[PDB]
Design a protein around this ligand. Structure first.
Ligand SMILES: Nc1ncnc2c1ncn2[C@@H]1O[C@H](COP(=O)(O)OP(=O)(O)OP(O)(O)=S)[C@@H](O)[C@H]1O
Ligand SMILES: [Mg+2]
Lengths: 187, 419, 240
């Protein structure tokens, strides 16, 4: 349920990011062509430079949103897999974790937290050992296709197009600029 | 089909409606004349329609009714209000009237009023008996105006900054003093949209005088509540009558136990316009301004109060500082000390582009004890203690820095106390 | 607290404060001190050209009648209420009864007279008319004690250093004519008790060779007199 909606959200965010990418590329090639041309359109050059700027900001925003959606999809998948694996082998985990997991309800908050972090560390060495012996890891069969479509990591273009950081004052001034440019293009 | 719908629609709808049913060459006249002509032609079929607007009375006993979308302008769209209506429904200036209007027969040009159906958004008959504004009892601003919007921008950071630097109360009287190019207009924006988001119950009114047309048109499309604005192109009498009618309309609204907020930018411009229009008294002060001129905008500012038995009238008016003209000062110290709160700004903070530019030490409020509780009063006092020592620019940098990572003002308080 | 302790009976006096110094609640405290300590005296609280909410608070937190003029109406209302309150005070004097007046503020009344008085050509530095001077002098000297029976007395309120220039001229002429003047701010205390003008006049001649007792006349006595608060010092400028 949640995985399907998250997957379609991620795919449409990726589509929008690609749309912004090719729009920015078209604007850039248009600006370069007019710079190379003999035509002395200073006003058009400034307008195209503004277009380049606003398209770059829109691409950054789209890449950020797509990254957030990808992370949300991965988090939801991890949570669901852990929930069902726990429903399967809760007694199996608890048999090993009993020395500091029993009496959880009656333990005080600080004792609860210290036991939680101790078990956390111990399972961390367990995980690093399992990875040290090092098989080939594979997706769960229930939701393999969604994850392989999403992929282990997002596109490198998404991560390096979001490298720059804009103060949200710049973000809102760019929001006004983008709204004005969209209205002008519609006109 | 009320006047409001076709008044609000853009030029395209007007020209389309004109060319659909037989208006010729309708594209080459002023919009108020356009709506007058098209509505007269449509009403020639004798179909009574509803009306809306705010009434006023001129020197003669006859009265006019204007529209809000027309920026309170006297023109062909004005609606007759006979003095018989004034007697038979105890009418007084500023009452918003809704009812059937009368198409014009021979001998008159404008549209009259057939009947009244809604006075001040209320039934006309039950409003016959009402309490006048003069005998109302003023009271402190007991209710806090929680304008912390919590949307998640540095504009919200400015909102939180004046939350931490000012105590905006329901029904108070506030003054804002700032040099030019410091952030006044969109600080007033902050106030407007924060009130709209946090307090939809109260009505929002923004009054702008002798402002540039681009500022007016960007203000009209940004605030949720209705906004009245008259640019500098119009003469002084335009601004004067706009201010009079809007303040008395707010008076009529608050007479109905309503919460009204008026954002004025500026009050110095209003004083200058009143001085220009008022007859000379022969007792001129420094700067070419006489005595009785300042009285009118000054009672205007004094109109703000809080009613004990219901309703509040808040006025947030801006005052120009150090513009190089002596009368700007004259007004500055003439209104100084007459407001329930003062909000000061410095241009040098804006020079280094730290925003907003509110002077934390200079900004203050009167009677904070009754407005808030003791615990939050002490919680703000300890911030005053810790932020008073360093400089105001350093104070703002420190505040915005350690407030950026904090979601709300409360969490900011409990994050400071542990330090 | 008690007016007899501070203002006594029959003699005038002033209190002068800067903006943001605690005027309203101090006047409140004086009002209830008069009400409890001397209920026989007729209370009279008066306000000129200030916020209506404080007018309502004053008239609601006291027992005596509070004729006040808010800051909305022009100064003609202020001037005419001034004559009518002074006339009713004179009538109460003829009524053989003591009265106490809490007026706020005399600087407001004085510069209202200044901005309302007709031009007479006797203006001074800052455009201060002479009529707008001795009409306030008449009003302020009408507060003399009643020697036949009873005693009228008023407590005055004045504002200082309000960022303007009109107020300090009337302040210094009140200093010239003041009976007693309570002070709150820092500098004006030394300005009054140790006149900078007199200090500069003396220093122009340096240590003036005042012969015999003329040098010894200038004396300063600090007596830690017993006070209910506990050892409040009193400093007196003894002259010959
Ligand atoms: N919180 C803020 N967010 C974004 N920009 C701000 C902020 N505060 C100040 N500024 C900048 O401050 C500059 C001036 O702001 P204005 O509101 O136009 O000044 P002003 O006080 O209204 O004086 P006027 O209207 O020009 S006479 C603008 O370029 C804004 O970008
Ligand atoms: Mg502005």
């Amino acid at each position: 349920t949640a995985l399907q909606q998250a997957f379609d959200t991620c795919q449409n965010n990726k589509a929008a990011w690609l749309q912004r990418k090719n729009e920015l590329a078209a604007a850039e090639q248009e600006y370069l062509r007019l710079l190379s041309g003999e035509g002395r359109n200073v006003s058009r050059l400034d307008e195209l430079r503004n277009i380049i700027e606003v398209r770059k900001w829109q691409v950054n925003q789209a890449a950020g949103r797509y990254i957030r959606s990808h992370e949300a999809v991965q988090h939801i998948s991890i949570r669901d897999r852990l929930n069902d694996f726990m429903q399967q082998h809760g007694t199996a985990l608890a048999a090993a974790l009993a020395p500091e997991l029993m009496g959880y309800s009656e333990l005080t908050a600080i004792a609860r937290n210290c036991a939680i972090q101790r078990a956390t560390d111990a399972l961390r060495e367990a995980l690093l050992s399992w990875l040290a012996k090092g098989e080939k890891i594979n997706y769960s069969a229930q939701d393999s296709d969604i994850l392989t479509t999403i992929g282990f990591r997002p596109d490198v273009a998404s991560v390096d197009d979001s490298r720059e950081k804009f103060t949200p004052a710049q973000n809102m001034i760019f929001s006004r600029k983008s709204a004005q440019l969209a209205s002008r293009q519609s006109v | 089909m009320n006047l409001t719908e076709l008044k609000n629609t853009p030029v395209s709808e007007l020209i389309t409606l004109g060319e659909n049913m037989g208006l010729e060459n309708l594209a080459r006249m002023r919009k108020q004349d356009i709506i007058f002509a098209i509505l007269k032609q449509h009403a020639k079929s004798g179909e009574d329609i509803f009306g809306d607007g705010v009434l006023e009375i001129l020197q003669d006993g006859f009265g006019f009714l204007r529209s809000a979308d027309s920026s309170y302008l006297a023109g062909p769209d004005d609606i007759y209000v006979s003095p018989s209506q004034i007697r038979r429904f105890n009418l007084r200036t500023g009452d918003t009237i809704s009812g059937k209007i009368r198409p014009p027969k021979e001998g008159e040009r404008y549209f009259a009023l057939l009947k009244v159906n809604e006075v001040n958004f209320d039934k006309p008959e039950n409003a016959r008996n009402k309490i006048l504004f003069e005998n109302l009892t003023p009271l402190h601003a007991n209710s806090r105006l929680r304008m912390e919007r919590g949307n998640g921008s540095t504009e919200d950071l400015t909102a939180r900054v004046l939350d931490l630097a000012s105590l905006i109360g329901r029904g108070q009287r506030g003054l804002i003093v700032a040099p030019p190019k410091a952030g006044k207009t969109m600080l007033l924006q902050n106030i407007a949209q924060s009130i709209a988001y946090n307090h939809p119950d109260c009505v929002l009114m923004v009054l702008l005088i002798d402002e540039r047309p681009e500022e007016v048109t960007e203000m009209q499309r940004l605030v949720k509540g209705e906004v009245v604005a008259s640019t500098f192109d119009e003469p002084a009498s335009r601004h004067v009558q706009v201010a009079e009618m809007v303040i008395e309309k707010a008076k009529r609204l608050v007479e109905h136990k309503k919460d009204v907020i008026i954002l004025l930018d500026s009050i110095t411009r209003l004083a200058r316009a009143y001085n220009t229009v008022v007859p000379a008294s022969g007792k001129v002060l420094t700067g070419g301004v006489d005595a009785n001129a300042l009285h009118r905008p000054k009672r205007f500012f004094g109109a703000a109060r809080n009613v004990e038995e219901g309703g509040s009238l808040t006025i947030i008016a801006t005052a120009l500082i150090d513009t190089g003209s002596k009368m700007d000062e004259v007004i500055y110290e003439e209104f100084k000390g007459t407001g329930n709160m003062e909000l000061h700004l410095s241009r040098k903070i804006a020079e280094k582009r730290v925003f907003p530019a509110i002077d934390y030490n200079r900004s203050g409020t009167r009677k904070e004890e009754l407005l808030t509780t003791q615990e939050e009063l002490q919680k703000m006092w300890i911030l005053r203690k810790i932020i008073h020592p360093m400089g105001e620019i350093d104070a703002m940098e420190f505040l915005i820095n350690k407030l950026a990572m904090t979601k709300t003002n409360d969490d900011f308080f409990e994050m400071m106390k542990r330090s």
